Amino acid sequence: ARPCIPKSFGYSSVVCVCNATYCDSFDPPTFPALGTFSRYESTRSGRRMELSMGPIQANHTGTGLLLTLQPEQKFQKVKGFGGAMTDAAALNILALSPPAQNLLLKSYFSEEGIGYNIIRVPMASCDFSIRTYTYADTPDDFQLHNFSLPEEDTKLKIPLIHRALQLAQRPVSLLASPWTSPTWLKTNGAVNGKGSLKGQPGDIYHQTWARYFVKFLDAYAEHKLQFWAVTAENEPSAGLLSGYPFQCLGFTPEHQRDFIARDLGPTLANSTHHNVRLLMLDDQRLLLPHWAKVVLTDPEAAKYVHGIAVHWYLDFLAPAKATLGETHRLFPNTMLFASEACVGSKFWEQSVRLGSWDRGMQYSHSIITNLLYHVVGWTDWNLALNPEGGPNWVRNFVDSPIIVDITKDTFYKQPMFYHLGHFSKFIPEGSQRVGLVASQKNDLDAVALMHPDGSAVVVVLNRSSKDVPLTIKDPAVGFLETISPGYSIHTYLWHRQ
Ligand SMILES: *[C@@H]1O[C@H](CO)[C@@H](O[C@@H]2O[C@H](CO)[C@@H](O)[C@H](O)[C@H]2NC(C)=O)[C@H](O)[C@H]1NC(C)=O
Numbered sequence: 001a002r003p004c005i006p007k008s009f010g011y012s013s014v015v016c017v018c019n020a021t022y023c024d025s026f027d028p029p030t031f032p033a034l035g036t037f038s039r040y041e042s043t044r045s046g047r048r049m050e051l052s053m054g055p056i057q058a059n060h061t062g063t064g065l066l067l068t069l070q071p072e073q074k075f076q077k078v079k080g081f082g083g084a085m086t087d088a089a090a091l092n093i094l095a096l097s098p099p100a101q102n103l104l105l106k107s108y109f110s111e112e113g114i115g116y117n118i119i120r121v122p123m124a125s126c127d128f129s130i131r132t133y134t135y136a137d138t139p140d141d142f143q144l145h146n147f148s149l150p151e152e153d154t155k156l157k158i159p160l161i162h163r164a165l166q167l168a169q170r171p172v173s174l175l176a177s178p179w180t181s182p183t184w185l186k187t188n189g190a191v192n193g194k195g196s197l198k199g200q201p202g203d204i205y206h207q208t209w210a211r212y213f214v215k216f217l218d219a220y221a222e223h224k225l226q227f228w229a230v231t232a233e234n235e236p237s238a239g240l241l242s243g244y245p246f247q248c249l250g251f252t253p254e255h256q257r258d259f260i261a262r263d264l265g266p267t268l269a270n271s272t273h274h275n276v277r278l279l280m281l282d283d284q285r286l287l288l289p290h291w292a293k294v295v296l297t298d299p300e301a302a303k304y305v306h307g308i309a310v311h312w313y314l315d316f317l318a319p320a321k322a323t324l325g326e327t328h329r330l331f332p333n334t335m336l337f338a339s340e341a342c343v344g345s346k347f348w349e350q351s352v353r354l355g356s357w358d359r360g361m362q363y364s365h366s367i368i369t370n371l372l373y374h375v376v377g378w379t380d381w382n383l384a385l386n387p388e389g390g391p392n393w394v395r396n397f398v399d400s401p402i403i404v405d406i407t408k409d410t411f412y413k414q415p416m417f418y419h420l421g422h423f424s425k426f427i428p429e430g431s432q433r434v435g436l437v438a439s440q441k442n443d444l445d446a447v448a449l450m451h452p453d454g455s456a457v458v459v460v461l462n463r464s465s466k467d468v469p470l471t472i473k474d475p476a477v478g479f480l481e482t483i484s485p486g487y488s489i490h491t492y493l494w495h496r497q
Pocket residue numbers: 005018019020021022
């Protein structure tokens with residue numbers, strides 16, 4: 001419908017400039033006849049999800065890399081894709097004029113945008129907050145009669161989530177994660193640093209903390225929002241590190257195991273919110289498989305855990321086979337879900353790099369690795385930041401796919417936004433990953449999935465400078481002869497009948 005208005009900030013590629021009256025957007029999707037494919041292309045050179053169509057033909061003219069679809073080789077079903085409604089994201093969005101707010105939310109949540117179907121909601125304050133509150137800061141309130149939602153929830157987050165859900169045709173799944181308990185439940189009496197819950201699982205501190213989850217779900221339910229899932233804690237490993245600067249709550253895998261078994265599992269099960277799923281870990285993938293082995297080999301905890309939430313810092317190395325691969329092999333019936341990703345966290349990398357193709361490539365590369373190792377969903381961090389990567393009460397350190405400039409009522413869509421969109425827009429909930437066999441060693445990243453209705457989607461990422469000639473074979477339809485340009489990402493779609 002409307003193309004990218006590009007702007008360079010001196011990095012490897014462009015952002016797409018949006019304001020109160022103009023944002024780039026797509027027409028309603030349109031699937032062509034058997035024997036025709038659709039292709040969406042983004043390039044470092046500046047193409048942004050540009051649509052073309054071409055033939056799937058009977059004869060194979062390619063002599064290079066062949067990728068063969070193997071629809072009978074079936075893997076995980078996809079839960080979906082989205083991002084986090086932090087205090088920071090909400091403050092940034094709501095500082096735009098209402099028409100620019102509309103266009104930002106449509107970018108993420110409408111069929112004319114990239115069709116997000118997942119929102120992660122912090123339970124009270126995190127580093128991406130302007131202050132350090134919880135829902136129950138009055139001490140010695142073990143029954144949580146003084147539990148309440150502040151302005152950050154009732155004026156910023158909840159109205160924005162309502163607007164996100166109105167724009168989305170797809171059902172949206174909400175995921176909740178806490179950073180800290182009230183400080184009077186904690187060994188260190190503080191929101192951050194090395195500190196766990198007081199006492200031991202089963203006791204009055206552990207039971208109050210479990211009840212705080214139910215209180216949160218009740219308050220959100222009064223505002224007509226229902227959660228798909230909650231995590232047991234955001235980054236439980238972090239609250240064991242002395243001088244950890246952000247809101248945290250420390251758990252050893254043994255303490256998470258017993259907290260779920262004795263307190264959180266039973267408390268949610270006995271509540272009106274018993275259908276809400278519980279994810280464990282919500283932490284870096286180098287804690288697997290050890291963390292899953294500790295929690296899931298205990299039947300009294302394992303019966304309450306629907307899945308494992310993993311984080312990754314895309315700046316760092318983590319071998320997927322030894323972590324995600326091994327966890328799947330040991331616990332093949334407990335879904336893996338990427339609950340948080342971000343980039344820029346290294347000292348020498350600027351927090352926000354407007355138009356960084358490399359950061360885009362890190363997003364798409366990480367989504368393909370995840371999908372190739374059984375992960376069912378991928379959730380970005382902050383939906384939007386300011387050009388300094390804020391607000392953050394501790395320190396700005398990561399990027400965001402949308403950067404808001406309130407002084408100009410403008411927002412910038414980064415390459416990360418398009419690299420995410422090449423998946424989120426074209427892989428609806430219930431899509432299943434299927435085989436895609438490479439005929440020979442190659443430098444592309446590729447993944448194939450089948451839509452619920454049986455149609456094919458293949459994403460091809462070229463992180464090299466060299467054009468790669470490519471053929472895709474669908475045994476049912478024929479040969480797609482294509483080129484993966486250097487520093488490109490392609491999404492291919494086609495009917496199989
Ligand atoms: C919002 O962005 C749009 C698109 O860049 C701007 O629209 C244009 O306005 C210029 C100068 O006024 C015209 O010559 C162009 O033809 C317009 N382009 C399009 C494609 O409509 C608009 O200026 C921006 N709004 C503000 C207040 O800067």
